Every structure is written in C-alpha cells, then in structure tokens.
C-alpha cells in the first residue's frame, strides 16, 4: 500500500522514501481524485497521530520536529499541484473556494525590542504538527504589523512572545491596541518573563476578548484547540475568566499584606564589611578595555553547559538522571538526549571547522568607589576623592521585610565596593560577549525546510555565548585581574559557582534596571568594539549575547532585590535625575505598590 507507508514515514520521521511514495500516491488518482485528498487523508492522519503522541507524552520534541520536517518535505512536493488546481479553478470558475484543510490560522510574533525566538519557533513547529496554519512574523515585530498580519491572513489566534521584562509593556500595548480597534481575536501570552499572575492582572483586564497565558507548546495546542472548538469556545472562556478573577483578587489582597521597610531603615540594616581587616582589592593588569576579535571556539566547547540545551529540546530527565551527562542513562529520554547531543556535536564541529561562527567580546576594568547605593567609576590617573566620576552604576536595595528569625542584611550591589571615604581603592569590571553568524545559518536552514537544524543552531549559539562568558570570567579571575591567580577548578565547579566573585547582569534580580546597559555600552564602547547592539528595549542583539559587571570581592554573592516601595523609587529617580514615571516603567515588575 501507500497509505501505511506514508503513515510510517511520518511517525518514524524517515526522510528517504517519502518523495517516491508521495509521487505514487499522486499518480493513484483512483484513490485520490484531487491532490488535496492526499493532504487531508494520510498526510494529516500521520501528523495527527504525531501530535496526539506528543500531547500524551509518548513522543518527544525532537521526534516531533523530525516528523514535521518529513511532512513539510511531502507538502513541498504537493504544493505545485495544489497551486495548479487553484489556478485552473480560478480560470474556469472565476473564483477560488474556501478550500483550506487546516484547523485554523495562528499568528506568531515576538513583540518589539525582543530578539529571542527559539521558543516561538518550537511553538510554531508543534502547532504545525497539529494541522494549524502558523504565521511566524519574526522578532521585533511592531504591534501594527501584528494586527495587519492578523487582519490580512484572517488569523483565528494571535500569540505574543517575549523574553525580557521590557517586553511585557509591549504586550500590554498590543492588548490595548486590539481593544481600541475592537478586535475580538483571542490573545495568547508566552515567554520566559511572562507569568500567569502578570497576564491576569496586567494584560487580561485591558482586552475584552480572551487572553490566556500559555506555558509551552504542549499547552498552547490544547488552548488553541479548545478556543477553536465551538462546543467548548465559551465554557472555556468562562473558566478562564473565573480563575483569572480569583487570582486577580488574590494578588490585590496580597498587595495589602506585604510589609516593606523604609529606605533609611533598610540602608541602616544593609550589608557591611570590615574594610580595615578584609584584604585589599587587587589592581587589574590594565585599566580600560581589551577587545577580542576572533575567539577560539574550540576553547569554548569544553565550557558549554548542556543542561539548558537539553531543556530547550524539553528533554527533562527524571531523578536521579536530571542532567548532563547522567541524562543519557535515563530510560525515558536517554535515547533522544543521546541523538540530540550527537547531532549538536556534529554541527558544532562543522561550524567551528568551517569558521561559520565568530565570537567577539570586550572586557574592561576601572577604579570604582561606592557612595551609599551607587558605584562611581573613575579614571586611572585621577584621585577618587577629588575627581568627577566617569560613570555611575545605581544599585537597588532590598526593602521587603525578612523573617524575624533571619539575620540577613538588606543587600545592594554598592555594598560589595569599598566606600569612597574609607581611603581604600577598589575596582569594577564589565564584559560583553556574543556569538555571530547564528542568524544567517538559521535562516539558511529554515529556507531549506530544516527546522531541526535551525533550532539546534540557535541553541548552540546560546550555549557558545554562555561558554564564552564563563571562559572569559575564568580568565579575568586568574589572568586579566589576577585576584584568583592560584585558582584551579573544573567545569563542574564553575557551573556550581564555587569560585570567588560574581558577574551580575543588568536586568537580572540583582539589578532589574535594564537601563544599566546604556552606561556599560557608552563606557566600554561595546557596539564599536564588538558589534553587539542594544535594541530600543535595551535587549542585546544578536540574541546569543551575554554581558554584566565584575565584582571581585570575596563576600560578594548573588541576591534578589525583590519588591521596592515608593520612597526608594523616588530616591532612585532623584539619583538618576529622571522622571519617576520612567523609573516605574523600567522597574515595573519589582514595584511593590499599586500603581493602578
């Protein structure tokens, strides 16, 4: 037969034989009067089987992507004949009928200012495996472009994606723009920075039509199917409304209970050092910026942290094999993990040998002194006590009240730098690294119909950027700064952060202000030296980029700022000499008071 071979090829993801089978199925016009009957018949039968297996957990994401590639290869051969049929019927009858076999049209876009689209690509692949007609608008999509695509393509569902917290305001703007134009299309919210609480509290009330937060693709398919099913279209929305009202009330009643210390009391109870007995900071080997133009990628492969890479493919091993390299011993995901690891290593070797990826970075050191909550950087030849600082990094202090049994201080990043009036010199470093050429390679793989290679190359770009960051931090600790010159640690200990010193990044829990990237880019001249640019939402382009500061102090450790009150917001606005509204815009997720 040919039906059972098409099904087997789709389910097992066999690339070799689907072209001839599809051709012979087309030639069997007795079974299929039109080429569409091939598509709605066995082809979507196998795709539905794959989607049902993925939803039930019996089939994993890499196998699903292989099946999607096989299906795409089949429909690519069948497209010319469908186009011929449509043209012939348009000439003969003057019209083209509503002959679409998909379950619905779904628009996927990444909101303005965000460049991360691996999750969006995975969601699109999984939705396509469920016979959805996915429109992928790409990264940094303007809102008006999203509604233009929805209106022109007659989209049934619009899905927004975002990875950084400035994107949440863009999603809210999109929601209120659909509300202003009275669009009733359901809206889905996805991404790493997104949460169910933020959606129901901030995004959902602005838009009357259903707004649903989707954690991943396996739930996005359920949400889309339940929204497009007219028997469950309204009851599902009623349940969503009930649960979102419940969590809205819970959030607005939790806002009353939480206690925050006054900023002065938090400052008094802040972290402290004995600078008269702790060892003095070590001056770096140079002051200024050193630029890396073409880093050795083979030196970065041994530093790659593979657990976040397996998490991208949703290969989450069970206890005790929850991570690399023990994940290969898992009976459930071990085989697929091994296959994905082997393909990743093969393509990594190919890309490094072919010089298709380039790594660039800049690292800098400047003398730095702390003034309460701020760190002021100075020139090498200037006296800190009698010179105007060249740049300032404004820290945020914890205000949320800690448990009465706890003795932890209220941390700030300026507590790890010696104060200006203590008479002790101190220094601060910063870096920015990236992996280039990922966009072109991903575009080339997608143009060939190979979304598996595109997803893996995006994942490998992120892995190489993180490996470059880790290796550069190891070099700084031992060679470029030499405050840990005798240190010798393996990759596992670096992954465990057992060394001394931290490399906090702007926008992260230690400093959730993304405007700290502007000072770094102006000071270290990162754009001109390395080509890494900041978008209008201060995201790093390319998406495989890492940046941050360097704190060499022994006691320095990672911490979460948490929630801040109005007094700290006004103090921060006064220090930065900016409007309080801008401070609330950039620090929105960490505001602890009702701005509504």
Swiss-Prot record:
Domain of life: Eukaryota
Tissue-by-tissue expression: Widely expressed. Expressed at the highest levels in pancreas, heart, brain, skeletal muscle and placenta. Expressed at lower levels in lung, liver and kidney.
Ligand binding (methylcob(III)alamin): 40, 113-117, 161, 165, 217
Location of Phosphothreonine modifications: 595
Ligand binding (S-adenosyl-L-methionine): 305, 503, 558-559
Outcome of substituting residue 402 to N: Decreases binding to MTRR
AdoMet activation domain sequence ranges: 254-596
Residue span(s) of domain B12-binding N-terminal: 1-90
Localization per record: Cytoplasm
Membrane-spanning segments: none
Outcome when changing residue 294 to E: Decreases binding to MTRR
Domain B12-binding: 103-238
Role: Catalyzes the transfer of a methyl group from methylcob(III)alamin (MeCbl) to homocysteine, yielding enzyme-bound cob(I)alamin and methionine in the cytosol. MeCbl is an active form of cobalamin (vitamin B12) used as a cofactor for methionine biosynthesis. Cob(I)alamin form is regenerated to MeCbl by a transfer of a methyl group from 5-methyltetrahydrofolate.
Family of this protein: Belongs to the vitamin-B12 dependent methionine synthase family.
Assembly and binders: Monomer. Dimer. Forms a multiprotein complex with MMACHC, MMADHC and MTRR.
Domain remark in the UniProt entry: Modular enzyme with four functionally distinct domains. The isolated Hcy-binding domain catalyzes methyl transfer from free methylcobalamin to homocysteine. The Hcy-binding domain in association with the pterin-binding domain catalyzes the methylation of cob(I)alamin by methyltetrahydrofolate and the methylation of homocysteine. The B12-binding domain binds the cofactor. The AdoMet activation domain binds S-adenosyl-L-methionine. Under aerobic conditions cob(I)alamin can be converted to inactive cob(II)alamin.
Protein name (database record): Methionine synthase
Organism the protein comes from: Homo sapiens
Lineage of producing organism: Eukaryota, Metazoa, Chordata, Craniata, Vertebrata
Part of the intact protein present: 670 to 1265 of 1265
């Amino acid at each position: 037969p040919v039906e059972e071979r098409l099904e087997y090829a789709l389910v097992k993801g066999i690339e070799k034989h689907i072209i001839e089978d599809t051709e012979e199925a087309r030639l069997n016009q007795k079974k299929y009067p039109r080429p569409l009957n091939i598509i709605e018949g066995p082809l979507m039968n196998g795709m539905k089987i794959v989607g049902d297996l993925f939803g039930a957990g019996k089939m994993f994401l890499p196998q699903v992507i292989k099946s999607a590639r096989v299906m795409k290869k089949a429909v690519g051969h069948l497209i010319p004949f469908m186009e011929k049929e449509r043209e012939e019927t348009r000439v003969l009858n003057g019209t083209v009928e509503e002959e679409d076999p998909y379950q619905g049209t779904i628009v996927l876009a990444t909101v303005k200012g965000d460049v991360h689209d691996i999750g969006k690509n995975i969601v699109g692949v999984v939705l396509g495996c469920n016979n959805f007609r996915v429109i992928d608008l790409g990264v940094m999509t303007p809102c008006d472009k999203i509604l233009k695509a929805a209106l022109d393509h007659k989209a049934d569902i619009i899905g927004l994606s975002g990875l950084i917290t400035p994107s949440l305001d863009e999603m809210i703007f999109v929601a209120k723009e659909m509300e202003r134009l009275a669009i009733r299309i359901p809206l889905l919210i996805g991404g790493a920075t997104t949460s169910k609480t933020h959606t129901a509290v901030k995004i959902a009330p602005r838009y009357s039509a259903p707004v649903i937060h989707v954690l991943d693709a396996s739930k996005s398919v359920v949400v889309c199917s339940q929204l497009l099913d007219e028997n469950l279209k309204d009851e599902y929305f009623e349940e969503i409304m009930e649960e979102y009202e419940d969590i809205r009330q819970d959030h607005y009643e939790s806002l009353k209970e939480r206690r925050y210390l006054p900023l002065s009391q938090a400052r008094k109870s802040g972290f402290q050092m004995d600078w008269l007995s702790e060892p003095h900071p070590v001056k770096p080997t140079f002051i200024g910026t050193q630029v890396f133009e073409d880093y050795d990628l083979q030196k970065l492969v041994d530093y790659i942290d593979w657990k976040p890479f397996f998490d991208v493919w949703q290969l989450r091993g069970k206890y005790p094999n929850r991570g690399f390299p023990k994940i290969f011993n898992d009976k459930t995901v071990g085989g697929e993990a091994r296959k994905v690891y082997d393909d990743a290593h093969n393509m990594l070797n190919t890309l490094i040998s072919q010089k298709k990826l380039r790594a660039r970075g800049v690292v800098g050191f400047w003398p730095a002194q702390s003034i309460q909550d701020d760190i002021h950087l100075y020139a090498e030849a200037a006296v800190p006590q009698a010179a105007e600082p060249i740049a300032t990094f404004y820290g945020l202090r914890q205000q949320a009240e800690k448990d009465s049994a706890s003795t932890e201080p209220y941390y700030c990043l300026s507590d790890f730098i010696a104060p200006l009036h203590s008479g002790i010199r101190d220094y601060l470093g910063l870096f920015a690294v990236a992996c280039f050429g990922v966009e072109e390679l991903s575009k080339a793989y997608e143009d060939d119909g190979d979304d598996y290679s595109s997803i893996m190359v995006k994942a490998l770009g992120d892995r190489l950027a993180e490996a470059f960051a880790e290796e550069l931090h190891e070099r700084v600790r031992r060679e470029l700064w030499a405050y840990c010159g005798s240190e010798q640690l393996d990759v596992a200990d670096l992954r465990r952060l057992r060394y001394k010193g931290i490399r906090p990044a702007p926008g992260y829990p230690s400093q959730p202000d993304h405007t700290e990237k502007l000072t770094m880019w102006r000071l270290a001249d990162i754009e001109q030296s390395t080509g890494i640019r900041l978008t209008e939402s201060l995201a790093m382009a390319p998406a495989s980029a890492v940046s941050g500061l360097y704190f060499s102090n022994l006691k320095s450790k990672y911490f979460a700022v948490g929630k801040i009150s109005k007094d700290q917001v006004e103090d921060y606005a006064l220090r930065k000499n900016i409007s309080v509204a801008e401070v609330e815009k950039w620090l929105g997720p960490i505001l602890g008071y009702d701005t509504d």
